[PDB]
């Protein structure tokens, strides 16, 4: 599944719902800390629609548990990420992923 650990608190009140668009900054890392992707490096927040299945399951279910303004560490099992096949060569088979996610706003 996905484990959500707070880095810094959000408002504690505004949680995203299915169909809403979330705006986030994120960094994705493998278990040894290697970064594989980051919106901060592009200086461009990332948007996705909750429930559209346009991101991996853990990032979706994890952000659903975040409030606006929160920054959190999401640890995601491979079955909630890229599974047995992965995303070669950047994501190996059966990889647990760690994302640092900041929920900036809902649209």
Numbering used by the authors: 1 to 107
From the primary publication:
The peptide prolyl isomerase FKBP12 (FK506-binding protein 12) was initially characterized for its role in binding the immunosuppressants FK506 and rapamycin. The ternary complex of FKBP12 and FK506 with calcineurin inhibits the enzymatic activity of this protein phosphatase, blocking a key T-cell-activation pathway involved in tissue transplant rejection. The binding of FKBP12 and rapamycin to mTOR (mammalian target of rapamycin) inhibits its role in regulating cell growth and cancer progression. Evidence for conformational flexibility within the 80′s loop gains particular relevance due to the fact that this loop provides a major proportion of the interprotein interactions for each of the four distinct protein–protein complexes that have been structurally determined for FKBP12.
Taking advantage of the close structural similarity between the wild-type and the evolutionarily conservative C22V variant of FKBP12 and the increased stability of the cysteine residue-free variant, the G89P mutation was introduced into the C22V background for crystallization trials. Following refinement, the backbone ϕ and ψ torsion angles for Pro89 were found to be (−92 and −12) with the ϕ value being nearly 180° from that of Gly89 in the wild-type structure. Furthermore, this crystal structure adopted a cis-peptide conformation for the linkage between Pro88 and Pro89. The most unexpected aspect of the G89P crystal structure was that the indole ring of Trp59 at the base of the active-site cleft was oriented perpendicular to the conformation observed in each of the more than 30 crystal structures of wild-type FKBP12. The reorientation of the indole ring in the G89P crystal structure occluded much of the volume of the active-site cleft, conflicting with the binding geometry observed in the crystal structures of the FK506- and rapamycin-ligated proteins. Since the crystals for this variant diffracted well beyond the 1.50 Å resolution data that we had initially collected on our in-house diffractometer, we collected a second dataset to 1.20 Å resolution at the National Synchrotron Light Source. During the later stages of refinement, dual conformers were allowed for both Trp59 and Glu60. Minor conformers for the two residues were obtained at occupancies of 0.29 and 0.34 respectively. The similar populations for the minor conformers of Trp59 and Glu60 in this crystal structure is consistent with a concerted shift for both the indole ring orientation and the backbone hydrogen-bonding geometry for residues 59 and 60, which, in turn, appears to be at least partially coupled to a reorientation of the Glu60 side chain. The two perpendicular orientations of the Trp59 indole ring exhibited by the 1.20 Å resolution structure of the G89P variant reinforces the observation of a small difference in free energy for those two conformations in solution.
